[PDB]
């Protein structure tokens, strides 16, 4: 009663894959970085009176 308007689950899956490649071309590397770099075992847990 309507027709063929919407993509298949497989065809839409291919569209999403193309979208991923397009974004990766613009951004080839992860742009964010956390303040910490090492594992949890490489940092002491200490308390201080404050910065000053």
């Amino acid at each position: 009663g309507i027709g063929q308007i919407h993509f298949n689950v497989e065809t839409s899956r291919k569209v999403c894959l193309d979208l991923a490649k397009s974004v990766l071309r613009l951004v080839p590397v992860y742009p964010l970085v956390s303040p910490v770099k090492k594992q949890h075992d490489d940092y002491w847990f200490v308390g201080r009176l404050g910065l000053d």
Binding site: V36, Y43, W44, F45, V46, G47, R48, L49, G50, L51
Partner: protein, 60 residues
């Protein structure tokens, strides 16, 4: 409503000494009125807390 005992006592002419590390949990209103009712009227000496008054922070 819950029943409660409240019997004021005669003043013995003595003060009260307390510590902050042992009274942080209780509200100040309950502590002062309770001690005053027992008969401690003239003096009060409070020992500051050992690890509950200063500022501080934790860091890696």
């Amino acid at each position: 409503q819950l029943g409660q005992r409240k019997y004021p006592q005669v003043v013995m002419g003595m003060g009260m000494t307390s510590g902050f590390d042992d009274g942080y949990n209780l509200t100040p209103e309950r502590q002062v009125k309770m001690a005053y009712g027992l008969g401690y009227r003239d003096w009060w000496t409070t020992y500051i807390g050992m690890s509950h008054y200063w500022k501080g922070l934790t860091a890696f």
